[PDB]
A = this chain, B = another copy of it.
Amino acid sequence: SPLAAYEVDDSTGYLTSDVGGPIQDQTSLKAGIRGPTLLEDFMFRQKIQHFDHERVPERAVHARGAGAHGTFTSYADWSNITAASFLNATGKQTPVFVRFSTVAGSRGSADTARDVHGFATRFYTDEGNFDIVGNNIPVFFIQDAIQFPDLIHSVKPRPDNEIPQAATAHDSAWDFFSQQPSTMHTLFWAMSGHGIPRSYRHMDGFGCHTFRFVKDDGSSKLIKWHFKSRQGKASLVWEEAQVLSGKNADFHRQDLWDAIESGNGPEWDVCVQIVDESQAQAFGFDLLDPTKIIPEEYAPLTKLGLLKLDRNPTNYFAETEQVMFQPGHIVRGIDFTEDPLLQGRLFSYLDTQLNRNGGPNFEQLPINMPRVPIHNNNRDGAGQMFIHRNKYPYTPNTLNSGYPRQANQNAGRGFFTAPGRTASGALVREVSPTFNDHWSQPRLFFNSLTPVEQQFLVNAMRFEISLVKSEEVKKNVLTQLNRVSHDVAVRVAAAIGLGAPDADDTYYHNNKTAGVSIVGSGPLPTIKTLRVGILATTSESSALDQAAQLRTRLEKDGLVVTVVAETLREGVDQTYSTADATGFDGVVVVDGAAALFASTASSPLFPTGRPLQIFVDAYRWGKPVGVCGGKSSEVLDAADVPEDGDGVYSEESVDMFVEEFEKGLATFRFTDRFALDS
C-alpha cells in the first residue's frame, strides 16, 4: 500500500507482451508440427530473454535476509536535541521499511547459521530518506573500513573450493581473528546466543557507531542508536539451530511473515544513549572506536519512539531484494563522526548499488524512492525514468531563474555538517593509540553472561575451533582468548587437546554491565506467536478430542498450535513425517497417543521413532514439554524425562496443564538441562 502507485494487477485479462500486444506463451512457433523453432518467434524470445536476465548480483554481505513495511511513531518533540524532522513532534508518524539478514552466507543459505545479523531501517521522512544500517550486535570486528574485505574474505568460504557456507568454523576465519585482536569483542557476541537468535523479532538493533545529533542552533551531542525489542530477547541452542538449518532454512523469514499476517507485527523502542562532545574519551575508551559499547551504567537509554512492522511485501524481489540502504542517506539533524569504520562505509554503500542495479538510477526503484519531491541537476544514465522539464540543469544559472536553490544551515532546511567539528594534525595512515585495548570489553561482555550462558559461549568456541585444521592457528586463537579470560582459554583448550598459555592478567577484570545477557533478561514479556506442537494419533478419537480441547485453550492466548498425527484430517495440521522439534517452542503429548512412544512403534507413514524423537529433542533443547490427560508415565519413561523436572508438565486438567505450560513458554528455556564445566 505505500507503493500502491507501482502495483500491477494480473487477476484478470489476456496475456500480453511488455508492449501490450496480446499473445500466447505455451507453444513455440515451428516449421511444421515436428519441426525446428523459428527465429521470428518473438513471443518465445521476449519471455526467455526476461527469464535469462531475472537475476541480479546478491549483496556483497548480508545476502540472506527478509524485509517488511511499517511505521515509526515519535514519543516526543525532540527539537531540544536534534533538528531531525521525523522526530519533531509527539505522535509524528513516518513510514519505514526494515530488512533483517545474516552476514556471511549467500542467497539461500540458512537463516539459523551462527552469524552477526543485520537490522537495516529506512525512515521515509518528510525531509528525505534516512537509513540506520544496523546489526543485532553493537560492536564490529574491525576498527577501520579499509579492513572490511580482509574480514569478509576470511569468514566467507575458502576461495579454492567455496567451502564452508555461512560459517566462521574454518581455518581462515580463526586465523584472521587470532591475528587481528580487535575482532575479540564481536567474536564473543557471535559465539553467544546473539549469534543464533530465536527470531528477528527477538533480537535488538544497534547503529554500532557514534553519530551526532545536531540542533538547529548548530550544537551537537554524541549518540548511539539502540532498537530494543518489545518481544523480549531469545536464542536457539546450537544443536537445535543446526537441525533447523536443514528442516527449515526459511525459519526467520517465515516467523516474521507469519507474525505480521497474524496481527502480531513486531515492535522496538527506538532509543539513543546521548553524551556530550567532551565525553569522547571520558569512559575509558574512545567513542570513535566501533569495537566498544558505552555501558548503560554510564549513559542510560532515552526512548525516542516506536518502530512497528505490520505489512509484508507484495513482491519480494522488487521490494526486499532491491532495497538499497546507505548510511549516506542522512537528514538535517544527524551527522557523522570520525569513526574510521563509519567513514569508509559512506563510500561503499553508494558504489555497491552500481553493481547490484547495473546502472546509476537505483534511487528511482519504487522501494528506494523518497516520499517528497526531488529537485536536482542529476541527469541521464542507464534506466533514466524521469522526464526533466528544466533544460538548464547547471548552477549558477539565470535561464532557470537560479533554481534549484542551494539548501544549507540558514536556508531551505539544508543538511549541514555539525559546525563545531574540526580536524588538525598530519595527514596520516596511523591508528589512534586510544583504540589499542582489544580485550577489556570482551571480558566485560563475558562477565555479564550467566554461568550456562558462559558455558554455551565456551561450547560454541569448542565446536568451531575443533574444526580448525592448523595447530598453529589453534595455538594463536588460545593466545588471544587467554588475554580476555584465562578460564575461557583453559576450557576451550580442553576440547582441542592443546594446553592454554599461562594467564596474562593485563586486561582481566570483574566488571559487569546490564542488558547484554539473553539468559538473564527474564521471562519473555509476551508468548503470543510462540509455537506449540500437540502430538496426537488418529488411532484414538479421544486423542484427537484432547488435542482439539488443548487447541481451543492455547489459541485463545495467541499461541500458534500445530496438531501432529500419522495422517492429515479435520483438526490435524501436520503429519509426523514433516514434524520436527525445531518447529515448536513447546511440545505437548495427549495421553491418548501414548502407544506411539513405545520403542516397538513402526509405520510406513513416518520414520522409525519420530513421535518420541520430537519429544526427546524438545526436552534436550530446553523447551517446556509435557503430557496432558493424567497418564504421563509411559511417555515420560520412554523419553527418560523426569516428571518432577522444571519445565516438565503432567496434569489431567487441560486448564491447569495450559496455565503451567504457558509459564514455561515465557521462561522459554530450562537451562538446568545443560552440563557445566566444574
Contact of A322 with B by CB under 8 A? yes
Q: Contacts A127-B20, A129-B19, A249-B109 known; A358 to B383 CB distance under 8 Å?
A: yes
Other-chain contact of A399, B172, B286, B371, B375 (Cβ < 8 Å): B172
Contact of A521 with B by CB under 8 A? no
Q: Interface digits, A39-74 against B, CB 8 Å rule (1 contact, 0 not)?
A: 111111111111111111111100110100000000
Contact of A37 with B by CB under 8 A? yes
Q: Contacts A129-B21, A379-B153, A427-B31 known; A40 to B160 CB distance under 8 Å?
A: no
What are the residues of chain B within 8 A of A9 when measuring CB–CB? 389-390
Contact A399 B434 (CB under 8 A): no
Among listed A335-343, A534-542, A626-634, interface-contacting one: A335-343
Chain B nearest CB: distance from A207 CB in Å? 16
State which size class the interface on A falls in: 35 or more
What are the residues of chain B within 8 A of A368 when measuring CB–CB? 19
Chain B nearest CB: distance from A574 CB in Å? 12
Chain B nearest CB: distance from A379 CB in Å? 6
Contact of A33 with B by CB under 8 A? yes
Most B CB contacts (10 A, CB to CB) among A149, A357, A417, A430 go to: A149
Contact A359 B360 (CB under 8 A): no
Contact A387 B52 (CB under 8 A): no
Contact B17 A376 (CB under 8 A): yes
Q: Contacts A328-B42, A382-B53 known; A165 to B249 CB distance under 8 Å?
A: yes
What are the residues of chain B within 8 A of A358 when measuring CB–CB? 358-359, 382-383
Contact B36 A39 (CB under 8 A): yes
Chain B nearest CB: distance from A197 CB in Å? 17
Contact A403 B13 (CB under 8 A): yes
- A407: nearest residue on chain B (CB-CB)? B22
Contact B395 A343 (CB under 8 A): no
Instruction: Give the residues from 411 to 456 in chain A that come closer than 8 angstroms, CB to CB, to chain B.
Output: 411-415, 417-419, 421-432, 434
What are the residues of chain B within 8 A of A301 when measuring CB–CB? none
Among listed A313-321, A646-654, A662-670, interface-contacting one: A313-321
Give bound CA distance, A351 to B350, whole Å.
11
What are the residues of chain B within 8 A of A128 when measuring CB–CB? 16-17, 19-22
Contact of A164 with B by CB under 8 A? yes
Contact B31 A31 (CB under 8 A): yes
Contact A149 B247 (CB under 8 A): no
Q: Contacts A148-B48, A249-B165, A425-B422 known; A16 to B180 CB distance under 8 Å?
A: no
Contact A25 B377 (CB under 8 A): yes
Contact of A592 with B by CB under 8 A? no
Known: A22-B127, A423-B424. 18 other contacts (CB 8 A): A8-B389, A10-B403, A21-B127, A21-B128, A21-B370, A21-B415, A22-B128, A22-B407, A25-B406, A28-B429, A33-B432, A35-B425, A39-B346, A55-B63, A56-B381, A176-B397, A315-B388, A398-B476
24 contacts between A and B (CB under 8 A): A8-B390, A11-B390, A15-B375, A15-B404, A19-B128, A20-B129, A26-B146, A26-B396, A30-B430, A32-B426, A35-B423, A38-B38, A39-B344, A53-B351, A53-B360, A55-B380, A106-B106, A161-B253, A166-B249, A175-B398, A179-B397, A245-B247, A317-B384, A319-B387
